[PDB]
Amino acid sequence: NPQIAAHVISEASSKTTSVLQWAEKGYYTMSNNLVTLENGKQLTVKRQGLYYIYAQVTFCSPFIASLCLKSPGRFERILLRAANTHSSAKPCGQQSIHLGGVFELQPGASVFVNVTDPSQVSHGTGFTSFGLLKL
Amino acid sequence: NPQIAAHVISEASSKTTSVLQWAEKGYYTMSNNLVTLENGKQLTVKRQGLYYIYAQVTFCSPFIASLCLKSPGRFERILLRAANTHSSAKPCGQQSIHLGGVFELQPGASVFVNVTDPSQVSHGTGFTSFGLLKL
Amino acid sequence: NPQIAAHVISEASSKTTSVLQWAEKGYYTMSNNLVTLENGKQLTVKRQGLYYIYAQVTFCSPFIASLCLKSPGRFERILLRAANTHSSAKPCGQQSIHLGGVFELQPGASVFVNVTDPSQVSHGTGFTSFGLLKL
Amino acid sequence: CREKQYLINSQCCSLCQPGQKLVSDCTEFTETECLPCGESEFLDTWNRETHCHQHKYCDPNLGLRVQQKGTSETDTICTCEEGWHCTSEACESCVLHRSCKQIATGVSDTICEP
Amino acid sequence: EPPTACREKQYLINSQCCSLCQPGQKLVSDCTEFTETECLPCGESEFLDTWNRETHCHQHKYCDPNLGLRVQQKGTSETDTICTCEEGWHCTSEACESCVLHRSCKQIATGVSDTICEP
Ligand SMILES: *[C@@H]1O[C@H](CO)[C@@H](O)[C@H](O)[C@H]1NC(C)=O
Ligand SMILES: *[C@@H]1O[C@H](CO)[C@@H](O)[C@H](O)[C@H]1NC(C)=O
Numbered sequence A, B, C: 001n002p003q004i005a006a007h008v009i010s011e012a013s014s015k016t017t018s019v020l021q022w023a024e025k026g027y028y029t030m031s032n033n034l035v036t037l038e039n040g041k042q043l044t045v046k047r048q049g050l051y052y053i054y055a056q057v058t059f060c061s062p063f064i065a066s067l068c069l070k071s072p073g074r075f076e077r078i079l080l081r082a083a084n085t086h087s088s089a090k091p092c093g094q095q096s097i098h099l100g101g102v103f104e105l106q107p108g109a110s111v112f113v114n115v116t117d118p119s120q121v122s123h124g125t126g127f128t129s130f131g132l133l134k135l
Numbered sequence D: 001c002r003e004k005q006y007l008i009n010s011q012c013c014s015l016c017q018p019g020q021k022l023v024s025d026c027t028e029f030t031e032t033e034c035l036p037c038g039e040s041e042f043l044d045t046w047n048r049e050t051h052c053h054q055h056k057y058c059d060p061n062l063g064l065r066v067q068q069k070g071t072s073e074t075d076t077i078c079t080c081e082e083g084w085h086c087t088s089e090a091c092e093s094c095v096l097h098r099s100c101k102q103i104a105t106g107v108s109d110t111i112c113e114p
Numbered sequence E: 001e002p003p004t005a006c007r008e009k010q011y012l013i014n015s016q017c018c019s020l021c022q023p024g025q026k027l028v029s030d031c032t033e034f035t036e037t038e039c040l041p042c043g044e045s046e047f048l049d050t051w052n053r054e055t056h057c058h059q060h061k062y063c064d065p066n067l068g069l070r071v072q073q074k075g076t077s078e079t080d081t082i083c084t085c086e087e088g089w090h091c092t093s094e095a096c097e098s099c100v101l102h103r104s105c106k107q108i109a110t111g112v113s114d115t116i117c118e119p
């Protein structure tokens, strides 16, 4: 296939990783060897271009899902960051957060979701995903 | 037209189902006979491919908008699900939820949003929509 | 580049106006002279088509981020609108809102985010963005 | 050009009557053509729009009610429910009549006393 | 062995060592054997505090008043802005991302600190 796109599923993070874990299971999508899931922690595009990256993080319990980006030869930064107010619910109350934008990615660049409370992100089927697609 | 895309407007419902209703009114979009709005309850693509589907649901109060997918010859499933906790406010307080991801759809496959409290989804102009576009 | 796409960063308004301000700073993206940032208040596409427009607004303290659209020769309207509430935390308590949809834009058409409390939208790096991309 | 008609590349096509979206522009053999707005949409003005507007929604969750339907050239009109009132000039949301002096109305609020 | 590496403020690319851009300027085009690396000054609100090879500058930190911060020190095209709490407010963290409000009740606070106490 010609189109570079990827959609990964969140996974029960081994333990101790402010940066979320993603697994190529479930109803995932990895168009081709032009987008890989390096170390199961980040997506790394091979062909430089303009991609639309996104990610949704669901947690329950000021929780912040940041989409820090790491390119070759440059200190990692911040593409987007979505904040969410702790919901005072009986056990905790589930809340979802969605990020998405158009960014210029050079070859070998990686993107990843980094949250403040990784022990809250709910991993139930379809609650937390991560993906990108090339414009 | 060559590009397959669609954006439909939410509409109240006379039935009681938790499956949201969508109408081709307002500032809607239906690129061509390759994406139809079957029974006004779901979008059905004809050409197999890799689409980006999305949907925003605004309700006025553990509210959960799911994007269960129904493909031919396979039990419908779950593409995404976004949760939200009921917060207090004067009449009911409004809350929006956004879903979106890249998925592989085969011909005749349909997608639909399914919420927990269809009797709360606010249908005001531009609050609740549903759509997809083919990469 | 052949592809028309744009991603702009929010900027602390001065006119403290309903319409949000956007600056081509930070990790922004402006594919070419086919999408400009007219008056730093709105994005204007030159070639007519089917675009995917989106915007995320993070504020804190019935907050409503709308995406009113202004086309040449037509009263401006409403593409999308996302609502949300005020969760009294300590100082303000942030919250993010995301909008995105597929719309038919004719040449000279401009899109813009218009919020209810512009004095609350947080402008911290990567919190509030705005953009589009042509299908 | 002039009222009830707009201009394009060089020729002037006429607008569409208030109650019909625009479909295709005019040329050198045929003029601007338009189809009516849905049975939930409308256009209250000689426009050149490609999508009609959808009838305003009187969301009951907010305490509103269909005061007057909308034709293919007039938007619907909402108002509060008996026992409710607007929360500002524009009747965006309604609230239940606070009880415990002068009563309240569609937009009026009540006032108590000993 | 031969000198197998670029200089301090450089960066190997295309089997050719180029010069990095100085703090305050973002890279615009890599460099050829003869023509050096063309950079360009960071816009307003932006900056780059290091000999970089970045294509987008960083935006000046935001001292969102909603959180109780204030512009302590603007930012140049080579230094990010510096924020601090409002008089009568203090940080909720050592890095100082959000401000609270000096708790009353004996070491006076400094926003960047707190007000200790006892009877
Ligand atoms: C995200 O990961 C970085 C390292 O990549 C870590 O230092 C940081 O604390 C994490 N979250 C953020 C951006 O605060
Ligand atoms: C999906 O629809 C089924 C049948 O209408 C319903 O039982 C279920 O609750 C819906 N999913 C939810 C709760 O979002």
Ligand SMILES: *[C@@H]1O[C@H](CO)[C@@H](O)[C@H](O)[C@H]1NC(C)=O
Residues within 6 Å of the ligand: C018, C019, C066, C068, C077, C078, C114, C115
């Ligand atoms: C912003 O847009 C909303 C709806 O589109 C409207 O209520 C408000 O008056 C607008 N603000 C202005 C006057 O720019």
